[PDB]
């Protein structure tokens, strides 16, 4: 298991534009095109993200280009995060996988704002940030996913992935 499955498969993959969990415009495997409920500003951004006229759809190579640039960029914004990076810079490889996809899902921002999980999952104390964590609107709305990461976090293996 690595990142992109990981998320390939919290994510999915759709090629016409969709809706997310939230009710905004989305594409690819997770892309998100805009927060407003304009389905042309959500069109326009699909064409300036893709560089062509798309019509709402596009292609897998087009959705996974997509999705290397996202990941990408979450990784980055954390290492460039003061209070992400030391803690994502002390956990072990499976682990890093689940703030990446935290990170993806939620954005750099939303994730800061775990202060306190943060700061248990520095210290190693698995349980007790697995508690914590599950204290939040991100579980309570995306609680399927929500608890696979929390596993990822608490046991440090992929068996929630399987
Ligand atoms: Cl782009
Ligand atoms: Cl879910």
């Given at each position: 298991?690595?990142?992109?499955?990981?998320?390939?498969?919290?994510?999915?993959?759709?090629?016409?534009?969709?809706?997310?969990?939230?009710?905004?415009?989305?594409?690819?495997?997770?892309?998100?095109?805009?927060?407003?409920?304009?389905?042309?500003?959500?069109?326009?951004?699909?064409?300036?993200?893709?560089?062509?006229?798309?019509?709402?759809?596009?292609?897998?190579?087009?959705?996974?280009?997509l999705?290397?640039?996202?990941?990408?960029?979450?990784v980055?914004?954390?290492?460039?995060?003061?209070?992400?990076?030391?803690?994502?810079?002390?956990?072990?490889?499976?682990?890093?996988?689940?703030?990446?996809?935290?990170?993806?899902?939620?954005?750099?921002?939303?994730?800061?704002?775990?202060?306190?999980?943060?700061?248990?999952?520095?210290?190693?104390?698995?349980?007790?940030?697995?508690?914590?964590?599950?204290?939040?609107?991100?579980?309570?709305?995306?609680?399927n996913?929500?608890?696979?990461?929390?596993?990822t976090?608490?046991?440090?293996?992929?068996?929630?992935?399987?």
């Open positions: 298991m690595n990142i992109f499955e990981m998320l390939r498969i919290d994510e999915g993959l759709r090629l016409k534009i969709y809706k997310d969990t939230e009710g905004y415009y989305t594409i690819g495997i997770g892309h998100l095109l805009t927060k407003s409920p304009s389905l042309n500003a959500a069109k326009s951004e699909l064409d300036k993200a893709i560089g062509r006229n798309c019509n709402g759809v596009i292609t897998k190579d087009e959705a996974e280009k999705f290397n640039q996202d990941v990408d960029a979450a980055r914004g954390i290492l460039r995060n003061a209070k992400l990076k030391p803690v994502y810079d002390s956990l072990d490889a499976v682990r890093r996988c689940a703030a990446i996809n935290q990170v993806f899902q939620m954005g750099e921002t939303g994730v800061a704002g775990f202060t306190n999980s943060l700061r248990m999952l520095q210290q190693k104390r698995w349980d007790e940030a697995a508690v914590n964590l599950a204290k939040s609107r991100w579980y309570n709305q995306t609680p996913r929500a608890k696979r990461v929390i596993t976090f608490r046991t440090g293996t992929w068996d929630a992935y399987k």
